[PDB]
Design a protein around this ligand. Structure first.
Ligand code: CLA
Ligand code: CLA
Ligand code: CLA
Ligand code: CLA
Ligand code: CLA
Ligand code: CLA
Ligand code: CLA
Ligand code: CLA
Ligand SMILES: CC(/C=C/C=C(C)/C=C/[C@@]12O[C@]1(C)C[C@@H](O)CC2(C)C)=C\C=C\C=C(C)\C=C\C=C(C)\C=C\[C@@]12O[C@]1(C)C[C@@H](O)CC2(C)C
Ligand SMILES: CC1=C(/C=C/C(C)=C/C=C/C(C)=C/C=C/C=C(C)/C=C/C=C(C)/C=C/C2=C(C)CCCC2(C)C)C(C)(C)CCC1
Ligand code: SF4
Ligand code: SF4
Lengths: 159, 165, 62, 80, 95, 203
């Protein structure tokens, strides 16, 4: 059974499960269904937003925050309609409007994208917002032993 | 050692107010001294006090203390690496010692609870067994960790007497 | 004979008891159908200084 | 006057009655305890409230309880 | 007129939103969340005659029962959104 | 019945004797149940091995410098030494990344030897007693001779090296010179370079 480390509520039915529940948040079956769908939405938004962010960061150079700045109305109404329609449906059929291994790899790549986006958020906070995440990756590719996180004096104390 | 200024506090070694504090105290000592002829014992005692004041002020200068506007050293207890000797290391020493005292006490009270008459041994302390438990309490952090992991540190809820509420 | 045998340790269940949730030795159980037949003896004294009192069958557990 | 209540945990040791300084308490026959007797408080009007009965009651928790209420001359223990 | 277009449009937009998007959710919530009750019974059922429910709140020919109180609530929301937009816009213009 | 640290008295009950290094030495009774006892046997193994490596790596720069064949720094200012491939913290984070995997696998073995290489799926570990894996961990791998003797030899050498490493840590904390420098000074004047001249110049 694939697991988050060899030799350690959770069942095989949940797609792409690896035993990782230290806090046992998914212990509650009710909360477990909400947590499943919660992760699902999170990773879907994170794949799209990673793809966006790499594009915008690189777009005309700059960063994702640089191309960030009544304007909210148009997005708000459409997303509210879509989200209400998603909510109003029933469990395990509300997802696809119109196989298992595809879900497995989808969710795994999603978790990677979520973690990458969280890293983008952390790096933008830690750094002075000058270089973007792609630019930070390029810097790491330049001289990784001397531009890694410990050389950053904001991520760590004592410079 | 030379410490960086922190929280608007200059180092005591380079602080003019620290030098003024030293100067003032030493001058007071001299004044106290002047009335005594040098041969008499109070004169030597006061000179030794002056020496002690000088070496104290010097040691406080070198020990990386931060002084304020008043001119007296100020302790940094936020955890800063440059001022760990102010609170962290003596804090660790206190936590170790106090936990030793407490664990020696807990061990003795638990051991005496098995005696035929525990309350008499509570006031007449079995000194050999007491000292044995006291020196066993040198490894208090370990033994406390064992008790926590095994669940015997804390008594269960059902065994403890409580109010009827 | 009903109730705990003599000599056993019984957990007190009376909420108001000084020795609530504590363990005490059973001295005797009265078989004449009294309301509180279980006599329980306690190592530790209460605020009144007594070391024993009477309990019902449902006010003890063993 | 005060209120004095006797509860069925009473063992009939008579110590509440012997401790009362105003003769409020008395022992009556009763099948509930081994000793065959329960206390009672007929002369509740004479209860000064000194709570000597509660101090002398061995049963845990107390089988006799005094609840201070309306204060009369006798309850206040006044010679005037 | 800039203010009139953005404001009227916004208010009507909010009204439509209440009428179709969150109307089923709002009605489901008022079904799930009963009338306020004190000691297990409604204020009116407990004697608060001044807590008598109104009658005009159900007199509606709307297919989705968008009563007058729903109209007033969603018009308030639309007015709040519109005036927020106007106010923010004025800040961004002259400050 | 085993050889005992205190010949006159008798060994404690919880110390069976079969343990590789059981000389009945447990005055402050930390042994107690066998479960934390195993946690200690493994802890002692690790402390002995790491301190043997520690003593050897704190002596070797000193031996090489004093002989004059490699002008290396002292162990205490070795971290202070500048010239490493990267910043002290950068290589420290890399170091702890590299050690997190190996030590959590050892913890899994501590918890369950059976539980714990996917890098080379053919490469496995032969099943062995906890704390003594063998296989790839001993490329020399001549265990066909005496075993318990050799394990006891490792343990006692480890215990000695740990006492030695604590000693030298105190020695630098009280003299501020290399351990071999302290050693040779004690050779030069044995009656006037010993502990009585320790002063605690710096922690
Ligand atoms: C918000 C994103 C999110 C959400 C809702 C979940 C939720 C879930 N994950 Mg997923 N997961 C995520 C991010 C997320 N994860 C990321 C980034 C990783 C990679 C580090 C993982 C790695 C992972 C593995 C390997 C496994 C799960 C599993 C689970 C389930 C049980 C754990 C639980 O109840 O977590 C609920 C989580 C939250 C409520 C978020 C709390 C966040 C805290 C407050 C801050 C951090 C549940 C469906 C297990 C499962 O059922 O398989 C699908 C499982 O085996 N997840
Ligand atoms: C997708 C994962 C991912 C990737 C590829 C990177 C990559 C990078 N980060 Mg970011 N970061 C991440 C997640 C990630 N980070 C997360 C989750 C956080 C929040 C804790 C941060 C917080 C962060 C800060 C604050 C800083 C960086 C910095 C950096 C750069 C170099 C130093 C470094 O990596 O150490 C930091 C790495 C970690 C703390 C690891 C987080 C755990 C990850 C999610 C595990 C998986 C990583 C990866 C897939 C494993 C294989 C590595 C292999 C390819 C070599 C480099 C561009 C530095 C930089 O550019 O400025 C100098 C910097 O200062 N990162
Ligand atoms: C000159 C120095 C000095 C002196 C005289 C005292 C004197 C005292 N301290 Mg203080 N203290 C000091 C420095 C000093 N302290 C410093 C520098 C620190 C920072 C570490 C503390 C932190 C500290 C705490 C946190 C507590 C005390 C307490 C006490 C009292 C009992 C201590 C004891 O050993 O009882 C004998 C010891 C025992 C009976 C064992 C009890 C548990 C001990 C106190 C701690 C062990 C628990 C463990 C390490 C977890 C700590 C959790 C904590 C971080 C919250 C006593 C009045 C205690 C007190 O009075 O609070 C009500 C208390 O709780 N001290
Ligand atoms: C066996 C020793 C022992 C131990 C382990 C504890 C432990 C504790 N006490 Mg208690 N306590 C003790 C003795 C002890 N107490 C004694 C002798 C007194 C009477 C002065 C008290 C009075 C007392 C009060 C009033 C309070 C506590 C509180 C607490 C808790 C907070 C930490 C603390 O100790 O700060 C308190 C520390 C002190 C008051 C200092 C007194 C401790 C002395 C120094 C120990 C003397 C015994 C010594 C070890 C010698 C006996 C053994 C020897 C013969 C071998 C903790 C559970 C507090 C609590 O409930 O927190 C949740 C609280 O409010 N304790
Ligand atoms: C930190 C390393 C370490 C560890 C984990 C152990 C652990 C063990 N030793 Mg080993 N031992 C060590 C160091 C260590 N020893 C050293 C340096 C020596 C040489 C002086 C020995 C000599 C020795 C002998 C001769 C024997 C043991 C025995 C034992 C076992 C008894 C249980 C016990 O009380 O120990 C648990 C102890 C700890 C977890 C650490 C204690 C730390 C102390 C209390 C605080 C520091 C004080 C100190 C003065 C500094 C256990 C497996 C007995 C055994 O059965 O053999 C296997 C036995 O006969 N050991
Ligand atoms: C355990 C342990 C640890 C933590 C260290 C750590 C270190 N050693 Mg030491 N060493 C050890 C054991 C250890 N060694 C053993 C067992 C031997 C034999 C040596 C022999 C040795 C030599 C000969 C040298 C080091 C050097 C070094 C440093 C650089 C290592 C590197 O790869 O770059 C570093 C501080 C080097 C050094 O001094 O770098 C400045 C160096 O020249 N070590
Ligand atoms: C005095 C030093 C000493 C001694 C006698 C041993 C002896 C032993 N070790 Mg240990 N070991 C030591 C130091 C030592 N080790 C150190 C410093 C490390 C850390 C690098 C290790 C790491 C280690 C591991 C990871 C493993 C062993 C294993 C073994 C056994 C077989 C290999 C061997 O060295 O035997 C040959 C005989 C000798 C006398 C050589 C001594 C070394 C000299 C330089 C044997 C019981 C293996 C085992 O369990 O085997 C069954 C095993 O898996 N040891
Ligand atoms: C294998 C153990 C071992 C060995 C061979 C040495 C050897 C030496 N030590 Mg070290 N030392 C040790 C352990 C050891 N020490 C331990 C455990 C401590 C902590 C208590 C110290 C603390 C220490 C200090 C503070 C000083 C020395 C000094 C010395 C030197 C002078 C001899 C002397 O005064 O003895 C001192 C011996 C002891 C204090 C303890 C006895 C050692 C063990 C337990 C028994 C013998 C084996 C000599 C090179 C001095 C130095 O630097 O000389 C130049 C010095 O100033 N030692
Ligand atoms: C990482 C993350 C959440 C992680 C949660 C984790 C690890 C929880 C794990 C646990 O529960 C488990 C599993 C097991 C439990 O026992 C314990 C824990 C450990 C607690 C969410 C990411 C969530 C990430 C998301 C939703 C990504 C969103 C991206 C978006 C919106 C795009 C935004 C942009 O497009 C805009 C808006 C504007 C442009 O200017 C900018 C860009 C950036 C281009
Ligand atoms: C006839 C009809 C129709 C139509 C209807 C309509 C269109 C209606 C409307 C209605 C409306 C149109 C309403 C409105 C309302 C509004 C309101 C009710 C308002 C309010 C306001 C407010 C509340 C305000 C507040 C404020 C102020 C005062 C100032 C400050 C700011 C603010 C904004 C907050 C149809 C065809 C569909 C159908 C059939 C019938
Ligand atoms: S009340 Fe207390 S004292 Fe008076 S009889 Fe009943 S038990 Fe004995
Ligand atoms: S209170 Fe004083 S008077 Fe009233 S009953 Fe108890 S004892 Fe007798």
């Amino acid at each position: 059974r694939p697991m988050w480390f060899p030799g350690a509520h959770l069942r095989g039915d949940l797609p792409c499960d690896y035993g990782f529940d230290p806090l046992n948040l998914g212990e509650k079956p009710d909360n477990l269904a909400r947590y499943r769908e919660a992760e699902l939405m999170h990773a879907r938004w994170a794949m799209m937003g990673v793809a966006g962010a790499v594009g915008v960061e690189i777009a005309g150079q700059g960063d994702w925050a640089s191309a960030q700045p009544a304007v909210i109305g148009v997005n708000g109404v459409l997303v509210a309609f879509a989200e209400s329609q998603r909510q109003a449906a029933t469990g395990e059929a509300r997802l696809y409007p119109g196989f298992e291994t595809l879900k497995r790899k989808e969710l795994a790549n999603g978790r990677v994208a979520m973690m990458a986006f969280f890293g983008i958020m952390a790096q933008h906070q830690a750094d002075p917002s000058g270089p973007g995440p792609v630019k930070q990756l390029a810097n790491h590719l330049a001289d990784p032993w001397h531009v890694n996180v410990c050389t950053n004096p904001s991520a760590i104390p004592w410079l | 050692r030379d410490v960086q200024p922190y929280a608007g506090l200059t180092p005591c070694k380079t602080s003019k107010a620290f030098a003024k504090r030293e100067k003032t105290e030493l001058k007071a000592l001299e004044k106290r001294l002047k009335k005594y002829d040098p041969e008499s014992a109070p004169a030597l005692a006061l000179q030794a006090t002056m020496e002690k004041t000088k070496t104290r002020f010097a040691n406080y200068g070198e020990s990386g203390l931060l002084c304020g506007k008043d001119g007296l050293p100020h302790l940094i207890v936020d955890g800063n690496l440059e001022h760990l000797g102010e609170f962290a290391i003596p804090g660790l020493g206190f936590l170790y010692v106090a936990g030793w005292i407490g664990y020696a006490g807990r061990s003795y009270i638990q051991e005496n609870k098995t005696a035929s008459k525990p309350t008499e041994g509570e006031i007449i302390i079995d000194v050999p067994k007491a000292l044995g438990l006291m020196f066993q309490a040198g490894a208090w952090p370990l033994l406390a960790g064992l008790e926590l992991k095994n669940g015997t540190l804390t008594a269960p809820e059902s065994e403890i007497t409580v109010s009827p509420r | 004979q009903v109730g705990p045998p003599r000599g056993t340790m019984v957990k007190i269940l009376r909420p108001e008891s000084y020795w609530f949730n504590d363990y005490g030795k059973v001295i005797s159980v009265d078989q004449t159908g009294v309301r509180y037949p279980v006599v329980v003896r306690f190592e530790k004294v209460n605020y009144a200084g007594v070391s024993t009192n009477n309990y019902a069958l449902d006010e003890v557990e063993y | 006057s005060h209120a004095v209540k006797i509860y069925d945990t009473c063992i009939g040791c008579t110590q509440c009655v012997r401790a009362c300084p105003t003769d409020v308490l008395e022992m009556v026959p009763w099948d509930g305890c081994k000793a065959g007797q329960i206390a009672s408080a007929p002369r509740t009007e004479d209860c000064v409230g000194c709570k000597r009965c509660e101090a002398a009651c061995p049963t845990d928790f107390l089988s006799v309880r005094v609840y201070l209420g309306s204060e009369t001359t006798r309850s206040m223990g006044l010679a005037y | 007129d800039d203010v009139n277009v953005v404001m009227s449009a916004s208010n009507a937009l909010a009204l439509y939103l209440g009428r179709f998007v969150f109307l089923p959710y709002q009605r489901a919530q008022v079904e799930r969340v009963g009338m306020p009750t004190q000691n297990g019974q409604t204020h009116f059922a407990a004697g608060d005659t001044r807590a008598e429910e109104a009658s005009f709140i159900t007199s509606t020919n709307d297919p989705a029962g968008f009563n007058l109180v729903d109209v007033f609530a969603w018009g308030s929301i639309g007015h709040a959104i519109g005036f927020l937009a106007l106010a923010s816009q004025s800040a961004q213009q002259m400050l | 019945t085993q050889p005992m640290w205190f010949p006159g008295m008798d060994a404690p009950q919880h110390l069976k004797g079969e343990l590789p290094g059981d000389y009945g030495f447990d005055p402050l009774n930390l042994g107690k149940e066998p479960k934390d006892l195993e946690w200690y046997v493994q802890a002692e193994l690790q402390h002995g091995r790491w301190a043997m490596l520690g003593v050897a790596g704190a002596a070797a720069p000193e031996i090489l410098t004093k002989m004059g064949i490699s002008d290396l720094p002292n162990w205490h200012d070795a971290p202070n030494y500048q010239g490493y491939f990267t910043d002290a913290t950068t290589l420290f984070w890399v170091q702890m990344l590299m050690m997190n995997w190996a030590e959590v696998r050892r913890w899994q073995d501590m918890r369950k030897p059976g539980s714990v290489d996917p890098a080379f799926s053919g490469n496995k570990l032969p099943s062995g007693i906890v704390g003594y894996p063998g296989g790839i961990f001993d490329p020399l791998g001549y265990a066909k001779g005496d075993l318990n003797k050799l394990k006891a030899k490792e343990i006692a050498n480890g215990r000695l090296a740990m006492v030695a490493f604590a000693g030298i840590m105190v020695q630098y904390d009280h003299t501020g010179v290399g351990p071999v420098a302290n050693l040779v000074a004690h050779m030069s004047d044995p009656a006037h370079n010993n502990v009585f001249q320790a002063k605690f110049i710096g922690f």
